[PDB]
CSV table of C-alpha atoms and ligand atoms in Angstrom, one decimal:
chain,number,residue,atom,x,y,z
Z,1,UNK,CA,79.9,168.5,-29.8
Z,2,UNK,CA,83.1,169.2,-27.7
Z,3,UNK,CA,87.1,169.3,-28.4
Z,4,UNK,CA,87.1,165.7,-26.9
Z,5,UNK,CA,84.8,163.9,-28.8
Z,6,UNK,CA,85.8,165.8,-32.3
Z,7,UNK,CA,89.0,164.5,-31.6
Z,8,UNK,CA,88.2,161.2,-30.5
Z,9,UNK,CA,86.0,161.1,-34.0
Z,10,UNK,CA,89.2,161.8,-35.9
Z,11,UNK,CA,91.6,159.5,-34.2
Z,12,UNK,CA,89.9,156.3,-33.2
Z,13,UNK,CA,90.7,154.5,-30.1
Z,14,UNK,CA,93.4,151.1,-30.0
Z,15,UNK,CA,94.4,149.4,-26.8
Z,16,UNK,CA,97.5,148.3,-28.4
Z,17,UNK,CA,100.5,149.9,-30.2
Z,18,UNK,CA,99.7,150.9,-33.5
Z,19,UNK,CA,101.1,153.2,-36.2
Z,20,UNK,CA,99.8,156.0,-37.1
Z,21,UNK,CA,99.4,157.4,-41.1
Z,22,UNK,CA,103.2,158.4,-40.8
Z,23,UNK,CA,104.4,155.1,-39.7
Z,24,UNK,CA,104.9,156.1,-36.1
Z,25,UNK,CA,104.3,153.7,-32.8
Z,26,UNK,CA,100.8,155.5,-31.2
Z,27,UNK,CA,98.1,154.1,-28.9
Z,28,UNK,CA,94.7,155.3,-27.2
Z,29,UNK,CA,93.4,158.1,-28.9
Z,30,UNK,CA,96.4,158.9,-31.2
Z,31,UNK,CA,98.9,159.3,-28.4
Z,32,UNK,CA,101.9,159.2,-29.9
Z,33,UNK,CA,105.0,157.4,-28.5
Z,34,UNK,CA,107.9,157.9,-30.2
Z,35,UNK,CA,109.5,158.5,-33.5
Z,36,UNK,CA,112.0,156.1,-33.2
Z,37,UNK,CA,111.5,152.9,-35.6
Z,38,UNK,CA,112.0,150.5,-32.4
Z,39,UNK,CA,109.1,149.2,-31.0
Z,40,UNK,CA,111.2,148.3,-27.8
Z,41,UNK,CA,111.7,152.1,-27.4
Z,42,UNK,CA,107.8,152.3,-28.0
Z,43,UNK,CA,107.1,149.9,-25.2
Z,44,UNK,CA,109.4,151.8,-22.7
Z,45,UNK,CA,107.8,155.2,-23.6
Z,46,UNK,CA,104.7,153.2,-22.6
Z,47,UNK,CA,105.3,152.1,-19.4
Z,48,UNK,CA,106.8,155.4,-18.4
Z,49,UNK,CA,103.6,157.2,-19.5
Z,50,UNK,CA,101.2,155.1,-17.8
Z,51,UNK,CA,103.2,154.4,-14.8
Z,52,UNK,CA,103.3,150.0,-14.9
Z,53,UNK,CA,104.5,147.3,-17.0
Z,54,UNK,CA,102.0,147.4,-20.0
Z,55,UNK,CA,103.6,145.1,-22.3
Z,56,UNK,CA,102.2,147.3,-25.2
Z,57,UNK,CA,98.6,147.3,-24.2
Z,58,UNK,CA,96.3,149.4,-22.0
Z,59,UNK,CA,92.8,149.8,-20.3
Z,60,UNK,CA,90.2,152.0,-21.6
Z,61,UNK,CA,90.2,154.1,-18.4
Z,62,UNK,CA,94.0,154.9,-19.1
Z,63,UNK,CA,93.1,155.6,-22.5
Z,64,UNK,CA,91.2,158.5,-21.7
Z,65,UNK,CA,93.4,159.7,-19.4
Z,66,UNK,CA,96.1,160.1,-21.7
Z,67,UNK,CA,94.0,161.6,-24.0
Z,68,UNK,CA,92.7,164.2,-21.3
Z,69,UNK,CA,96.0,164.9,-20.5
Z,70,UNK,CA,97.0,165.8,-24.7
Z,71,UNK,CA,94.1,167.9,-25.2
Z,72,UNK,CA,95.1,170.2,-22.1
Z,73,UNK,CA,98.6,170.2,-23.1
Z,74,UNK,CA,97.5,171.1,-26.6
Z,75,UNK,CA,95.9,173.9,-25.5
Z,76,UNK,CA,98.0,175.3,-22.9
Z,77,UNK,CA,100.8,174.8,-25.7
Z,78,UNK,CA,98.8,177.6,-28.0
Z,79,UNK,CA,98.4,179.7,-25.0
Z,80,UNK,CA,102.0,180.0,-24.4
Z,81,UNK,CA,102.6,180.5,-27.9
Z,82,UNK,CA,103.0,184.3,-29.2
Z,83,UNK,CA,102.1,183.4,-32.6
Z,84,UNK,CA,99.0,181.0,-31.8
Z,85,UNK,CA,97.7,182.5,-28.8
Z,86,UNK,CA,96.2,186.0,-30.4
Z,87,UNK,CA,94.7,184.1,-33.6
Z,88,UNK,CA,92.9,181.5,-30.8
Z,89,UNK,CA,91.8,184.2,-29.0
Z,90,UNK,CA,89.8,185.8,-31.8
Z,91,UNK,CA,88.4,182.8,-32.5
Z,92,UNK,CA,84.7,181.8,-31.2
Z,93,UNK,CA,84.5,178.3,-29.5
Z,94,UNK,CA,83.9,176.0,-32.5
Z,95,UNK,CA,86.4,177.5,-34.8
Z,96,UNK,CA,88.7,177.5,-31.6
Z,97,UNK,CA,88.1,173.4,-31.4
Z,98,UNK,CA,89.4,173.1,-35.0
Z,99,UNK,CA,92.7,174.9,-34.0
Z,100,UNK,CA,92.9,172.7,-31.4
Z,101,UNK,CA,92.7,169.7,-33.6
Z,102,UNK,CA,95.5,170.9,-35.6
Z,103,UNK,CA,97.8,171.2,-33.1
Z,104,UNK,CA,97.0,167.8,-31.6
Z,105,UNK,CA,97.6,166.3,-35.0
Z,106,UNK,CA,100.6,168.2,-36.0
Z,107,UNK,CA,102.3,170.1,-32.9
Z,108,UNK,CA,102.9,174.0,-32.0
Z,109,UNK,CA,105.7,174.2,-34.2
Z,110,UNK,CA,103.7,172.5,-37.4
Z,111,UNK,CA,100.8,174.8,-37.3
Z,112,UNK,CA,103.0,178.0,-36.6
Z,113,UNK,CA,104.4,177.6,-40.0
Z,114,UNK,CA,100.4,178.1,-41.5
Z,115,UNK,CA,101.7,181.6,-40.9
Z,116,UNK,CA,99.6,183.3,-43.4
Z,117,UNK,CA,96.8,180.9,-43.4
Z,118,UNK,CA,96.6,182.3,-39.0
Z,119,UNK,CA,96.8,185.6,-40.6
Z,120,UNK,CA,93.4,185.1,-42.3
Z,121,UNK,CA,92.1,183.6,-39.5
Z,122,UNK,CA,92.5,186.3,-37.5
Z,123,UNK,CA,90.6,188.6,-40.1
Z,124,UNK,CA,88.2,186.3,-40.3
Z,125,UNK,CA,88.3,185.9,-44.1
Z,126,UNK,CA,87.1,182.3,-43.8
Z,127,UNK,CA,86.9,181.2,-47.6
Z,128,UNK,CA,90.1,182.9,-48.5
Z,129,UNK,CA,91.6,180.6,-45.2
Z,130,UNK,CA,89.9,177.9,-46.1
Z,131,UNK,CA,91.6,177.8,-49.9
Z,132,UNK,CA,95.2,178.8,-48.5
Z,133,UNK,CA,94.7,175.8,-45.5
Z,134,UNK,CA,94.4,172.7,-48.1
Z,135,UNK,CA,97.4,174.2,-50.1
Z,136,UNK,CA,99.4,171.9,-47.4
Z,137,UNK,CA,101.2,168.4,-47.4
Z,138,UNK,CA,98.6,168.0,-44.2
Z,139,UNK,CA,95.9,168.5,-47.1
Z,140,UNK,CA,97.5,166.3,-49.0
Z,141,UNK,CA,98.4,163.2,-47.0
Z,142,UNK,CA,95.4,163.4,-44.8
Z,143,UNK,CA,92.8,165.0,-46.8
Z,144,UNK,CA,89.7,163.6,-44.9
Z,145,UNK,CA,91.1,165.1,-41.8
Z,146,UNK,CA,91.6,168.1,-43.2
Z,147,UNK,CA,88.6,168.3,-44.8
Z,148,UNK,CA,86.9,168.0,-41.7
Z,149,UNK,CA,89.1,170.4,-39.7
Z,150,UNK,CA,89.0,173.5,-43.0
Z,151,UNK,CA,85.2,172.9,-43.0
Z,152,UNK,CA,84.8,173.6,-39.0
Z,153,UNK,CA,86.8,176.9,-39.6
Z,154,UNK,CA,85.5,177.8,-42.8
Z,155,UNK,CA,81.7,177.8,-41.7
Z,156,UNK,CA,82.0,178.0,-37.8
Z,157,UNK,CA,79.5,174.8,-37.6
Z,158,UNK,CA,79.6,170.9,-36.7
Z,159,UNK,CA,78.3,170.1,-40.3
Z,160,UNK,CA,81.7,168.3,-40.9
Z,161,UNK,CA,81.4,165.9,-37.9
Z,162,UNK,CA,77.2,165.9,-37.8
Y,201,CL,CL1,92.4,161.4,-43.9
């Protein structure tokens, strides 16, 4: 198992505009668009993304593209980050894909408020994390997702996804 295909697990893959659990205009592999409630603004983000007139639908190939180019900016995002980057750093590589997951699904700014569920990551006091990470309106509104994700950085394994 890798970051890209835990991800692609988690979100799915559409050709054409969808919304995600939020309500949100997405496509690919949960490439979000835009926020805004008109699907005309959707359509534009589109074709400036991919670089043609999509009309609101796209290839495979640009699919996974797009999605190549959100994992890298995920993690490049948490390497910038002074609150993220030490906390990935002490991470070892699976535990390091579920941080990467979070940030996908929820931004730099939305995981740098789990302030002190980072801080037990960073001890490495996995059950005490694990406890203080589904204590969240992510736990709450997305709970298989999360379930998955808490699992990978409670135990360090694939079980969640295997
Ligand atoms: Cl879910």
């Amino acid at each position: 198992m890798n970051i890209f295909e835990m991800l692609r697990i988690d979100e799915g893959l559409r050709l054409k505009i969808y919304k995600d659990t939020e309500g949100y205009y997405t496509i690919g592999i949960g490439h979000l668009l835009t926020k805004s409630p008109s699907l005309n603004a959707a359509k534009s983000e589109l074709d400036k993304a991919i670089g043609r007139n999509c009309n609101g639908v796209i290839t495979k190939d640009e699919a996974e593209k797009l999605f190549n180019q959100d994992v890298d900016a995920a993690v490049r995002g948490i390497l910038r980050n002074a609150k993220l980057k030490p906390v990935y750093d002490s991470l070892d590589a699976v535990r390091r894909c579920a941080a990467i997951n979070m940030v996908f699904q929820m931004g730099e700014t939305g995981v740098a408020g789990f302030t002190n569920s980072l801080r037990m990551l960073q001890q490495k006091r996995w059950d005490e994390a694990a406890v203080n990470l589904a204590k969240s309106r992510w736990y709450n509104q997305t709970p298989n997702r999360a379930k998955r994700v808490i699992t990978t950085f409670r135990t360090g394994t694939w079980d969640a996804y295997k």
